[PDB]
Ligand binder design. Structure first.
Ligand SMILES: Nc1ncnc2c1ncn2[C@@H]1O[C@H](COP(=O)(O)OP(=O)(O)O)[C@@H](O)[C@H]1O
Lengths: 310, 314
């Protein structure tokens, strides 16, 4: 009874809230938040906050790999990373006057031995857990079919997969025969996959998620950010209506949403409860300055204002 | 060998991350492939230049955490000897975004040094003093240190007859200047020189002479004032020098202060005469400004620049 989170390209994420960003000048900051991040470790930390059994895996290397291990050790978060010869990356987010300016490093190249070695390691971890949450970019050096390989292994074992990626990486999965249990493209990402103009009408959205691309995927949950979410569970369509709140920092909120989904999947919660938990954790995060952080003293209050109807 | 060696001090080093972007897209995601992460801090630039010119050098200061380990690893790879005092706090990052001709920097305040660490480094420093003949001190004090910390360090050097080359600015500099234990060399540039005095920038020889001889700068053997492209103006004891310099093509002048410090410290260590010291200092500053890298020097061009510089007693 446990969740496996997979972060093949984890990151030491650094957040810089500035009063104003001065280009071509010096910007001074005091205390700064440096977290075990990349999408998958944001998921991990939120699942740990809620209290569910979670084990983090993926690739780490170098001094920044030790920094991530350390941050997890301090919160009592279990991990079984595969150690690589390369170096774990940084990513930066500059928060300034309403703007959110991010710089994402490519990350380390994984070699043939590490890539094959990790698959074997993953097979052992799969034995254990009852759900896998896969987040983010495939790191450089892995073959394009790497996630399809992982999901095939999950399917062979009957372990549901929540898949949080986008663009080419998700496209590759959707075209392969081994399907994740849940996918989560926002409206912008959804129509990008279709090579089609973005349209927020209801009939255009049902048409969008029923398109051949998403065949055999049980849950398709479409992030509409502050406007809420639109979701399909098998043949049933939902509109998730959410309240207005005061957003401090929205980064990592898609990941907080993944934490909620995966928690509901593990515990076999009903359609309404899954969708509410998901959007609730996504909201809590956007209200915290820290990314991948949730104030559970406010969970009940928000959850109660969410309406799931379409 | 078993004391002919320079000690550099970097009390607040950084792991500097450099992001060269095509453009920086604000309020959007920017992907970078070629990130460069280096062991940074003014004192480490000094150390690196000294290593290039081939002077015996040891680096010290404070380091901590995984980022402190990164710094030591970088210096090990470069074969630069170091004896940092280890702290519990974590060494900071600094960010440089290079985009569309711009250099946008984010500078972290960094760790706080506790009382035990502050006292520990001082004891450590007293031991290092036994095997060096010059100390180059660069940069501001980290958080948590008494404002008197550089004066404490300079007192220890004075007690051993070890000359100090001091490269800091503003209130950090002024605190040293107001204390009785003096550095051997300071190098405020012409704008800093008059701000320190609370005067307007008067670039006349008579004003320079007067400014440099104010009681704020009493007891300091060498005051070397950079005038940017025009060269330098200096006082040694009671003698004044003008250093005139060739016009050259500038790539990147960042780190040129650090290079001239390396030059000054090398010259002090070797007891070079006044002309040779000022020419070495300014040449290294010039060689760095010719380079895209920061704190980097092409010694193949050294002889050619050096021979052009004129030093005039004025
Ligand atoms: N500004 C906001 N106001 C209210 N809720 C938000 C806001 N931003 C995110 N959320 C919550 O988080 C969920 C995921 O948001 P999303 O924009 O996909 O995350 P990200 O910003 O990481 O892409 C949303 O469904 C919503 O419930």
């Amino acid at each position: 009874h446990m969740i496996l989170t997979l972060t093949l390209n984890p990151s030491v994420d650094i957040s810089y809230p500035l009063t104003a960003l001065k280009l071509d000048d010096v910007n001074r900051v005091q205390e700064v938040s440096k977290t075990a991040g990349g999408k998958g470790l944001n998921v991990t930390r939120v699942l740990a906050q809620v209290g569910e059994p979670v084990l983090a895996s993926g690739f780490i290397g170098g001094e920044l790999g030790q920094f991530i291990a350390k941050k997890l050790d301090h919160a009592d978060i279990k991990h079984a990373f595969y150690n690589i010869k390369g170096e774990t990356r940084n990513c930066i987010a500059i928060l300034h006057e309403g703007q959110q300016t991010e710089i994402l490093e490519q990350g380390p190249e994984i070699d043939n031995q590490e890539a094959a070695g990790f698959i074997k390691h993953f097979e052992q971890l799969l034995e254990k857990v009852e759900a896998v949450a896969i987040s983010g970019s495939l790191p450089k050096g892995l073959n394009q079919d790497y996630y399809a390989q992982i999901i095939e292994r999950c399917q062979n074992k009957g372990v549901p997969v929540i898949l949080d990626c986008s663009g080419a990486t998700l496209q590759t999965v959707l075209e392969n025969p081994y399907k994740p249990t849940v996918i989560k493209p926002n409206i912008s990402e959804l129509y990008q996959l279709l090579n089609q103009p973005l349209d927020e009408s209801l009939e255009s959205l049902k048409q969008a998620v029923s398109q051949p691309l998403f065949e055999g995927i049980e849950w398709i949950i479409v992030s509409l950010g502050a406007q809420g979410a639109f979701a399909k569970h098998n043949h049933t369509f939902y509109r998730v209506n959410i309240p207005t709140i005061s957003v401090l920092n929205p980064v990592g909120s898609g990941d907080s949403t993944v934490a909620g989904i995966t928690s509901a999947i593990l515990n076999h919660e009903n359609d309404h409860d899954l969708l509410k938990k998901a959007n609730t954790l996504g909201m809590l995060n956007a209200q915290e300055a820290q990314t991948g952080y949730v104030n559970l003293n406010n969970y009940d209050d928000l959850f109660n204002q969410i309406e799931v109807l379409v």
